[PDB]
RNA sequence: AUACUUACCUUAAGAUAUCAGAGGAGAGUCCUACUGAUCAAACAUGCGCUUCCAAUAGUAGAAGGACGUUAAGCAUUUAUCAUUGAACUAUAAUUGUUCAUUGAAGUCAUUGAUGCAAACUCCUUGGUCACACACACAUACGGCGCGGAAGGCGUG
RNA sequence: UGGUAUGUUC
């Protein structure tokens, strides 16, 4: 807001049994996927369930000493499994797009025309033709030079240095998705 | 558990006391009405300079600028 | 100081005047204003801050007064701890010369927009 | 409106000054858009020593500045 | 550990119900000791079992809605 | 002053050699430990005892407020106008011009022309059903056409279809205007 | 919205400035990152208390309401914020 | 209810409703019954005067002002009669109305 | 219902202003901001019977030669304590509150 | 909304994370540095001359001044004065950019050279050197330079390099002289110097 | 410069001077290249209006300073506390006197700080302008030259 | 329906 007093009033009004559908169980356990992708380009919109800080503090005080609720944990596990399946489908679509870009029609035609002319002295000529074909393949792959991120499914680069890569890893999408992968691996280690 | 607005709406019609910032003006009377900017309206208030009284006042309007707290007896 | 400050002028018209602005302490800042805002935050070019000492205050109470002057240069003063502002000294160039300078600035800005339109094409 | 940039003071010892002398040295645990400062293991320093509980919260109206006592 | 905002700090301070030392303005002001029961967005803090001690014989005060513009510092005694 | 953190090159930094540090002198005001307004302000009960008796004796009567009286007169005139409007609106069964048949077949056409005639309105209303009665309403103070008429047809379905056909196509084009038709709303 | 003086205070980031506080303590150091609320952070800070003494802080952060003034360097005498008739090259839709 | 989410351009009606039935009942009673009130200010300037207008900032127009303060050295009381006054609500400590 | 619009109808009015520092300012009003930043001309200002800060603020404004005569003074809103209007002006015609009348007619 | 007066670029609603990232990028740095350099060059190069005030001079001053002598005015052509003023401008900028660096290379083998003169193990301003490294997120900026860093750590002691003359030093630079007045040097030295 | 990846973000609203009357639109609201009045801005324009604009028939002087010198000028005022040892005035956390061990910070400044006072030098500004080196005035001063700078009032 | 900044190839 334009005044900070209305912001503090909003914080008070959103800060002040428990098994109700209005409480977001993924936020009640922690790290809701609709919260970790709020304003980025991969946004899901808005969470339909409400988020609260007093219920989160009560859940933390209950999980500290009192007890734990497996139903909200199972719902968060199902939501994390559905989001991980959607992200794995997006990563498979990105891998299929990369394989289609590596296997284009004109690129395969140029590679076949280079390999058709690739065939002591004959072995040295074949080695030179294979080196020229490898240089042509490296020049064709260097037109994009886009790898696949093994975790978040984005695009990376091999010739890029570690500082721009470290700038890439410190985003909202990557931190949220690594936290979701850690939660999914913890729940699969607890369940199995 | 409680908030100042339901506690202050329930503080109406009680012999309450208000200290000011100056440690020489304390008004003790019956609260009548209070807005959202917490202006105070009292009736049959009494002045208290450093504890000792000076006289009765009556219907009085205490501004929220110079209040320090309000108490319930 | 026979300056004859304008009778119907405001802060948009008092710009580039050598102000003598007073504060709550009395730490008087002398300098040219170049900008303001809604909270009256004043930037001050070639500014000097003058005060009077505590020993001089007895002589000032009912002659020469030795004020303490420090040089601030180009500062930016807030509008919270200020009290009043007056116009002390007129600027160097006149109103007609500022009008010719503003017309040259408008023609230069129009030429810059034509250069941006030529570079955009 | 704007959140103040106290991110570099996340796990470092700071020293607030209060109004001309009350130097409260603590560890910054959190802040708001109002410069209200949460300090763990507060300590009043006088020119003598006085301890101020385990946790404390300090109003941003009386806060003037703060010295970063720990290196960043 | 993590970040603890001042509104959630006062909220946990309200839940725990520790003994409270609330400071105020300078030499005219008087340090109060009590227990927090309610607050709001303008930091108008409601306290109970209040004993006031001046700056270096305490007197009981009852229940107090202390306003925001004089609150300086809150500690757990 | 020699080595900087600044992203700018050294040629910018030689242009950014700053001002010399400020010559500090002793302050003049009180420090913020002593900055406060006046204490020991006495109570106002002494003015109500002695000073009020001398203040009421010099001015026993106050000045009249002409602006507050004008605002109260405007509020009273608005209240009187609202009461007159309520008395004129509160005071269809006690009207001789509305003593026609039931409103199931009686439609009302409003915002008609002031120079129209009943023959053209009857010819326009008899196109989509047989009309039993027609009555154009006028003011009682003056004999001017207000643009309102009530047409009671022989059947309710034909009158409803005529009202729908006259109000669906942006009002019926009655010869100088667009007069829509609807229910009587009695 | 913001205004010219807060844009000028945000302009001189990473430069040797000199603050004066409301108590009388004068700070001087390199501005780290200024904000719209003028809650400014300084580095290599030399401080003069109102009592008179001189000390040195490493990393200070002062709140905007407790500032008397701040001195920017003189090369910001000529700034495009000071231009009165600077036109605007086609703001986006 | 939050202030920013009430409505648009109808906040003046709620301000008048708070004026008629809130803490403003004493400033409203003084301007319609022309009774003199005693306003104590933040610098011992006690004002006995009649209220002419009301403001959200408690900016009050006062007519036939009799003001009084006390100089403490020794103890003298200095008064002044001022015809018209426009008092700011910053200076106002308290407002007392006599019956 | 801000009464700064009442002072906006008080142009060319020869008034006095007592400030919070204690200075009495006798001068004619030219204009006033809606934030009550009032400009005055043909001004003499006087600190009555003290406050040494107010005496410093009185003398260090140029034009002292303790009545100080100055040509043009702008005064900030929070430094205004009270303003005294001339008694010859009719308050019943300047406080008509035409904005409040339009707001009442809009209701 | 936000508008950069330097880069002449607009922005979306005013986010501090976007505005902070705008003042770090290289295009804003180039435009800002060039603008500050050109405004400083304009306020140096602006020859604000005084408005001349010529009065009707005295009689005896005219009989004294018009009889003493008449001096000769020197003047040059356009390319000559252009070349001379260009050489004077490059001399003024190379004097404004230079500085004496004799104490850094004269105490190079000192035992506390790694604690003061290294400018990275300095105490008060060394954290400023270690903070902004300009971390070279471009791979070409890190792959361009292929020379040694020669970063002298603080922990270098007096045990390393015990004899400063065996480890080959550099002969110190001669005192540089003005090239316009280089023709008046004593052409004969005092002692015979070989090589 | 094109092509692509990544990091952040994707917007508080309403309006453009006021009053009175007439007309139009289905008590309330909107419009009029509709009419009268006030106010604001811009451009011109005039008021025997208000203030200022530096010798040259000399080697000066007006305004603002020196973060300049004489000048370490002249007259005053301060330059840490506590425990103990050998004496001690003594209501103090031995305060006071001479010497020391130890303990926490410990502005530099005593050529310091405040007040007083004169002389010299140097910086920024101008109409350094047109005629003449002249006998006017109680209705106190022929303001009846070409301009410039600041402002007031009046008209289109 | 977009903006700012950065890294590769031509």
Number of strands of chain J: 0
Based on Cα principal axes, name the global outline of chain J: flat
The profile of the biggest β sheet of chain F is:
4 strands, antiparallel
Order of helix and strand elements from N to C terminus of chain J: HHHHHHH
Oligomer: part of a larger assembly
Task: Tell me the β content of chain J.
Answer: under 5%
* First-to-last CA distance of chain F: 91 Å
CATH topology of the domain at 103-182 in chain F: Alpha-Beta Plaits
Secondary structure layout:
This is part of a larger assembly, with 10 protein chains of 10 kinds.
Chain B: H1 4-9, E1 15-20, E2 26-34, E3 40-49, E4 52-62, E5 67-72
Antiparallel strand pairs in B: 1-2, 1-5, 2-3, 3-4
Chain E: H1 6-16, E1 20-22, E2 31-38, E3 45-53, E4 59-66, E5 73-76
Antiparallel strand pairs in E: 1-2, 1-5, 2-3, 3-4
Chain I: H1 4-8, E1 14-19, E2 24-32, E3 38-46, H2 52-59, E4 68-75, E5 80-84, H3 91-94, H4 98-106
Antiparallel strand pairs in I: 1-2, 1-5, 2-3, 3-4
Chain J binds a RNA duplex (156 and 10 nucleotides) through residues 1-2, 4, 7, 9-15, 17-22, 24-28, 50-51, 53-61, 137-140.
Task: Give the tags.
part of a larger assembly, 10 chains, D: 72 residues, mainly beta, SH3 type barrels, six-stranded antiparallel β-sheet, 6 strands, 50% strand, globular, I: 107 residues, alpha+beta, five-stranded antiparallel β-sheet, 4 helices, 24% helix, elongated, RNA-binding, Small nuclear ribonucleoprotein Sm D3 (chain G), nucleus (chain G)
Describe this entry's structure for a reader.
The structure is cut from a larger assembly and holds ten protein chains of ten kinds. Chain A is mainly α and about 190 residues long. Chain A is about 65% helix and about 0% strand. Chain A contains eight helices and two strands; from the N terminus they run H-H-H-H-H-H-E-E-H-H. Chain A has helices spanning about 5-15, 25-30, 55-65, 70-100, 105-115, 120-140, 160-170, 170-190; strands at about 145-150, 155. A two-stranded antiparallel ribbon of chain A has the order 1-2. In chain A, helix 4 (about 70-100) packs across helix 8. Chain A is elongated, with a radius of gyration of 26 Å. The two termini of chain A are about 45 Å apart. Chain B has a single domain, classed as SH3 type barrels. Helices cover about 10% and strands about 60% of the residues of chain B. Chain B is built from one helix and five strands, in the order H-E-E-E-E-E. In chain B, a hairpin with a 2-residue loop joins strand 3 (about 40-50) and strand 4 (about 50-60). Chain B is globular, with a radius of gyration of 12 Å. By secondary structure, chain C is of the alpha+beta class. Chain C has a domain at about 10-85: Roll (SH3 type barrels). Helix content of chain C is about 25%, strand content about 30%. In chain C, a hairpin with a 5-residue loop joins strand 1 and strand 2 (about 30-35). The radius of gyration of chain C is 19 Å and the shape is elongated. The N and C termini of chain C lie far apart (about 55 Å). Chain G has a five-stranded antiparallel sheet with strand order 4-3-2-1-5, with no helix packed on it. In chain G, strand 2 and strand 3 form a beta hairpin. The radius of gyration of chain G is 15 Å and the shape is elongated. Classes of the chains: A mainly alpha (about 190), B mainly beta (about 70), C alpha+beta (about 120), D mainly beta (about 70), E mainly beta (about 80), F alpha+beta (about 190), G mainly beta (about 90), H alpha+beta (about 100), I alpha+beta (about 110), J mainly alpha (about 200). The interface of C and I includes residues 4 and 24 of C. Chain J binds a RNA duplex (156 and 10 nucleotides) through helix 1, helix 2 and helix 3. It is classed as splicing. The entry lists the keywords S. cerevisiae, Prp5, U1 snRNP, U2 snRNP, prespliceosome, splicing. The U1 part of Saccharomyces cerevisiae spliceosomal pre-A complex (delta BS-A ACT1).
